[PDB]
């Protein structure tokens, strides 16, 4: 099936699903940027760093494929806002569950500010592969 992407916002440094792409531009420094139209407004993002293939949700029967050190798109809830930003799995507490719901617990370190949090499979999306 078709490719779908997400783009990193230069405002909050989170990732959003790209609905479509509009145009591109080169910087005199040489970087390639792309104008991205989001889902749900309009940004320029570094192709090389800030554009990638959309993260994939993980099904309870899959949780074995997520490991310590992995990079993950994590749902990050705070006061008002909530963002989907990059983090790395530091430690995993495996639970007992079936195919219905994953109660394994993932300690991840957010890339931006280096903070830590315990997330359930329901709040993480893996990178392809
Ligand atoms: O990794 C990243 C890579 O760095 C990045 O350049 C690449 O971005 C992919 C380029 C943006 C896709 C876009 C969609 C249609 C219009 C032109 C092409 O994605 C890789 C993953 O496929
Ligand atoms: Zn699990």
Curated annotation (Swiss-Prot):
Changing residue 63 to A: Decreased stability of the protein. Residues 14-116 are annotated as: SAWADEE domain. GO terms for molecular function: chromatin binding; metal ion binding. Disruption phenotype: Loss of DRM2 controlled DNA methylation, but no effect on CMT3 or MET1 controlled methylation. Zn(2+) binds at residues 63, 97, 102, 104. GO terms for cellular component: nucleus. Changing residue 84 to A: DNA methylation defects. It is found in: Nucleus. One of its GO terms (biological process) is regulatory ncRNA-mediated gene silencing. Keywords: Metal-binding, Nucleus, Zinc. Its main location: nucleus. Changing residue 104 to A: Decreased stability of the protein. The SAWADEE domain (138-244) binds to mono-, di-, or trimethylated H3K9 histone peptides, but this interaction is impaired if H3K4me2/3 methylation is present. Associates with the RNA polymerase IV (Pol IV) complex. Interacts with NRPD1, NRPD2, NRPD3, NRPD3B, CLSY1 and CLSY2. Involved in RNA-directed DNA methylation (RdDM). Required for the silencing of some endogenous RdDM targets and accumulation of 24-nt siRNAs, but not for the production of Pol V-dependent transcripts. Functions in transcriptional silencing through both DNA methylation-dependent and -independent pathways. Required for both maintenance and de-novo DNA methylation. Plays a role in the recruitment of Pol IV to genomic regions associated with K9 methylated histone H3 that are targets for RdDM. Associates in vivo with Pol IV but not with Pol V and this interaction is not dependent on its H3K9me binding activity. This is Protein SAWADEE HOMEODOMAIN HOMOLOG 1. The lineage of its organism: Eukaryota, Viridiplantae, Streptophyta, Embryophyta, Tracheophyta. The chain holds residues 125 to 257 of 258 of the full protein.
């Amino acid at each position: 099936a078709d490719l779908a992407f997400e783009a990193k916002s230069a405002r909050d440094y989170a990732w959003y699903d790209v609905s479509s792409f509009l145009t591109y531009r080169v910087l005199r420094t040489g970087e390639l940027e792309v104008r991205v139209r989001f889902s749900g407004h309009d940004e320029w993002v570094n192709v090389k760093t800030s554009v990638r293939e959309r993260s994939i949700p993980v099904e309870p029967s899959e949780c074995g494929r997520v490991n310590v050190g992995d990079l993950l798109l994590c749902f990050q809830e705070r006061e008002d806002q909530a963002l989907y930003c990059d983090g790395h799995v530091l430690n995993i507490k495996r639970g007992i569950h079936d195919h219905a719901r994953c109660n394994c617990v993932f300690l991840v370190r957010y890339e931006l500010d280096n903070t830590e949090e315990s997330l359930g499979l329901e709040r993480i999306c893996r990178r392809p592969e």
